[PDB]
Ligand binder design. Structure first.
Ligand SMILES: Nc1ncnc2c1ncn2[C@@H]1O[C@H](COP(=O)(O)OP(=O)(O)OP(=O)(O)O)[C@@H](O)[C@H]1O
Ligand SMILES: Nc1ncnc2c1ncn2[C@@H]1O[C@H](COP(=O)(O)OP(=O)(O)OP(=O)(O)O)[C@@H](O)[C@H]1O
Lengths: 263, 257, 94, 257, 263, 94
């Protein structure tokens, strides 16, 4: 099918709040697609709807032709061999060192031999640069090193879809100088569909093929980088640069005010 | 309103809790089998649940067999009836004090250690990254912990009994000088294989399914905050060891009445 | 479907070097390294890391009990996957 | 080498563990006082440790008082000696089964809940952000949890006894028809205030200092990983309830021998 | 005394590794001082030595004239009323909502009244913009909102020293457009000495008065934004921009090759 | 040391409006708001948030049972601490 992830008309509700009014986005097969927006808008909630960890209210999420919430428990973990995910906080197995942590998702789904499961993941720890840290337990890594170890675990299997979730944060500009080249040389060399969610507007716009900017309830703009650079005038070019007013830049939907200050 | 609706609010929330616990076990046990990836994992959890708990049952098995030999002797020796001490030690244990006290010591050690582990695993994001790797957490974490708990309890009962009977045979025969032949011969034709030995085996299996189910559920549906895990651990020891003492009265009215 | 057979003096390959189907060639890594001068690599679609880690072993068994091996017919997809993983000129002869 | 040095390696590491636990308590109790910021915090931990554990002691107190009334009656009624049943129920509890079984049920519920809480508090970074706010964690977290544990155990013993004595007075006087006057009058002049009542109070305080110290130390010096907290909870129930059964033999040889 | 934090000759050892050979830095009183360097170099370890949570091996750490490792337990928590710290991961009290979380360090050390402890922290949740989120527990904040709630708790007391630790990460460029102005308008209006540790070389260099760049064992360069820009030629201007070789850009001190790849 | 007394028709302040010493003036917020036309603020060194949150209350008690109040003698340190906290022109009259 012509594009991998299709969202028809998705809605969501965290008890009382109304995020995702009537969003509808598509992800093509084999191209890096960015996702941006203000803080607390539901970008990580957008990635968790695709994986099936939470369910929408009003739409279908078509992963390669089949619906995600209309899928049973035994079929969901068969489809989930196709999509990996980097988490926001590292979130790696603390009772298991780095070499046994990168080698974990391809010890489950690949029947690779023992000196081939040792040569594959000794290359995955050279892409991010974290080789020689193959014996430290993940309580003596730093915290910017615990993302580069959880970035190798997102690309260890080479699945059909990778859903990154802020990979570039907490990195010096000689390490996110090569972590941006690793994602740009994975879909160029293996054909892996990536989904990059980040807050570095010069970094991921230089590599994505179809970006997306989110606003209050739904999509505000979306097109190739160049075609999404200043051509949407009123609400974009305030988010990409600027401090002053537009439609709701930040400041979570607060209540009155004075009543807050004065007793 | 308030006395009428809020007891309807807070009783319906228990009907979801019984449904959340039933749906957890059906998705954990009833599954597509794997006999060479769960079998190395069963040996780990049979070690963690059972073997580390074997020291607390051996040491506390000898003690409660001794005090039924000490306080059983002193109240019986005025009537010159100390040759019927074995009928008191080996019938308190084989009927009631065996399946129950070895259940409360199991819900303490193994019951809290399973709930404080799967609770903290859920809070340190190791159950979200495991299920986002096409690895079922109810088949990897819950399933070899249920089968290693339904096995470790009926074997830990017969170690609690067989040192409790021997513990009463240390202050009876050896320390207080009751005869070596009249002691054991009065115990032998008072213990039947159907009423006292199989009905202790049936009691331990029912307590093993009960304790292990409540211990895994309170450590799965727990709030991952600071006091969320500390009051799911308290919720394990109280609820799963009231269902021991609640089911024991029902069973002892059926198998011995 | 990984299909392979040498041409008599050159180990030709075909298919894809995936991680799904690789064990037919990992077992037969003994009779297909000796007496070979070049890996043809002509009509293999794509190479993954579960097919590139084999190639650093399939060259090594052919370097020691045979002719020093050379390569042929790449897509510049096993080269951008070689400078990415920082492989020196020892393990892969460019 | 290996048999000689590695037993010297692994025994010295225990000498640091005894020193780490002593230095923890001296810095927790011996401190600059505060009587209107720790006293609202003591009421919370007196509720968490004690009051939630009061249901498990009441229900399990009646049961172990009943089975010493059931199995105590059937072995005594052949000699027509059922009017000395109270000397068996109210002396098993006041001497040994009171301070010990109410200690093992305390180290289970309260002993694990304190170790699984301060362990997870240490792993979710709530002890690093508290000490970086000029707030002592050994005076805020450990100190009202030690005093609320040395208080809740000697009060939970006398609730375990007074329903165990009443539990044996339900199957003695009411259910099996022993006389209401000969039962209590045979119990009264066999229980002395110095040998049976104060020597149960002394037993409970020593078990309260012992259980609470090991429960807080294993939840403070724990590895904050996944199985680090699950084997510090197991380390609490085993070590702190072997020091119950180890100190009980020493004390019962001194106060009753 | 003329400068707040002085390090004479500090050394450190994580069991076997040797970080901090012979570093010696100073922090002036009332000026924002930056700290930069590659990943896994020990910047968070540099902040934890000042607080006294770990101890050095070879030096004195002079906080306002007195030594930190030569300080007893009852005197250390008297001096620690002067320094707060933002943590890397948020690290806020999960059993306590945001309004009772910002109001926590000034419910301990200030005897403020009840409608003044409610008007002070209702302003602290307006500086970062997180007002109206004063009732959510910190398990339903996002993760970029859980730093803006832990940023208000670092400035709630207004202590003499604030040790930020990556405050700008995981924020859109209209929110870190005002979080950079909050730190620049705190030492300009209250005289608070800040210590900023970050990996955003255009952001914090625009506000700091004396930056610091760390290298393999010790300091490599220091100087105001301009004095520290273009000035130091060989090893600086490779870290600030560039991909290729200098002295050890990244790739943790790995062992031998081949033998890792080949069995 | 927060020292204060009105000049008869203008509430003058002195010292610093810290969080260490503030309760001498929070208790006496009743006799020092009525009949005042302007807060002098002349020789106060600095104002913290535990001294600026009082000023939004000390103005409010003087606005309702007295003359509408005005301000005097700022350092542009209680103004850059006012646009930082986004205080409108109601609570602070610039
Ligand atoms: N239990 C919950 N867990 C997480 N988020 C919740 C929960 N309940 C409600 N929410 C809301 O859902 C939204 C989730 O948004 P999300 O976490 O994706 O923000 P984000 O895009 O990651 O922002 P940032 O990148 O700044 O962290 C938040 O605004 C939060 O307020
Ligand atoms: N128990 C431990 N906890 C944390 N770090 C440890 C521990 N033991 C050793 N280390 C080492 O100490 C160093 C600490 O450095 P630090 O965490 O400050 O890096 P960093 O500057 O925060 O890098 P980044 O910003 O990329 O996370 C790490 O390189 C780590 O390898």
């Amino acid at each position: 099918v012509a594009n991998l992830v299709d969202m028809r008309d998705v809605s969501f509700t965290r008890g009382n709040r109304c995020i995702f009014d009537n969003i509808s986005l598509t992800v093509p097969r084999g191209k890096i697609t960015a996702i941006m927006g203000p803080s607390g808008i539901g970008k990580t909630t957008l990635l968790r709807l695709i994986g099936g960890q939470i369910a929408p209210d009003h739409g279908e999420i078509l992963f390669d032709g089949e619906n995600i919430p209309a899928m049973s428990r035994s079929r969901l973990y068969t489809v989930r061999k196709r999509m990996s995910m980097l988490f926001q906080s590292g979130a790696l197995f603390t009772d298991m060192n780095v070499f046994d942590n990168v080698a974990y998702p391809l010890r489950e789904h690949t029947q690779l031999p023992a000196p081939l499961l040792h040569s594959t993941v000794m290359m995955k720890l050279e892409a991010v640069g974290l080789r020689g840290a193959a014996k430290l337990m993940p309580s003596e890594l730093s915290g910017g090193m615990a993302r580069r170890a959880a970035l190798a675990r997102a690309i260890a299997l080479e699945p059909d879809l990778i859903m990154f979730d802020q990979p570039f944060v907490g990195q010096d500009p000689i390490t996110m100088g090569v972590l941006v080249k690793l994602i740009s040389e994975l879909n160029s060399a293996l054909g892996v569909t990536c989904v990059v969610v980040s807050h570095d507007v010069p970094e991921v716009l230089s590599i994505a093929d179809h970006a997306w900017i989110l606003a209050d309830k739904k999509i505000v703009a979306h097109g190739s980088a160049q075609a999404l650079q200043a051509n949407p005038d009123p609400r974009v070019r305030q988010f990409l640069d600027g401090i002053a007013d537009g439609p709701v830049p930040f400041r979570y939907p607060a209540g009155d005010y004075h009543a807050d200050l004065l007793p | 309103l308030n006395a009428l609706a809020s007891l309807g609010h807070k009783g319906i929330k228990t009907l979801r809790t019984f449904g959340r616990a039933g749906l957890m076990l059906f998705n954990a046990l009833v599954g597509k089998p794997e006999f060479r990836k769960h079998a190395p994992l069963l040996v780990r959890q049979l070690y963690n649940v059972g073997v580390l708990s074997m020291l607390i049952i051996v040491v506390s098995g000898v003690f409660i067999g001794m005090v039924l030999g000490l306080q059983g002797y002193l109240v019986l020796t005025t009537y010159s009836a100390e040759t019927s001490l074995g009928m008191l030690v080996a019938l308190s244990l084989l009927r009631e004090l065996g399946p129950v006290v070895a259940a409360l010591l199991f819900a303490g050690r193994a019951g809290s250690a399973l709930t404080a582990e799967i609770g903290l695993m859920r809070a340190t994001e190791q159950l979200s990254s495991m299920e986002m790797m096409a690895v079922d957490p109810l088949r990897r974490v819950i399933s070899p912990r249920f089968w290693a708990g339904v096995i470790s309890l009926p074997l830990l009962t017969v170690i609690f009994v067989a040192v409790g009977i021997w513990g009463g045979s240390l202050v009876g025969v050896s320390w207080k000088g009751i005869d070596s032949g009249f002691f054991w011969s009065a115990m032998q034709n008072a213990v039947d294989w159907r009423m006292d030995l199989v009905n202790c085996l049936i009691k331990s299996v029912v307590f093993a399914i009960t304790v292990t189910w409540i211990s895994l559920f309170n450590g799965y549906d727990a709030i991952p905050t600071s006091a969320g895990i500390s009051r799911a651990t308290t919720r394990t020891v109280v609820h799963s060891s009231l269902a021991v003492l609640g089911l024991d009265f029902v069973l002892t009215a059926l198998m011995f009445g | 479907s990984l299909s392979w057979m040498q041409t008599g003096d050159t180990l030709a390959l075909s298919g894809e070097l995936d991680q799904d189907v690789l064990l037919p060639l990992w077992e037969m890594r003994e009779e297909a390294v000796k007496g070979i001068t070049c890996i043809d690599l002509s009509r293999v679609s794509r190479v993954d890391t579960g097919g590139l880690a084999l190639l650093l072993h399939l060259i090594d068994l052919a370097k020691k009990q045979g002719n020093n091996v050379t390569l042929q017919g790449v897509n510049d997809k096993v080269y951008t996957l070689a400078k990415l993983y920082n492989l020196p000129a020892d393990v892969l002869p460019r």
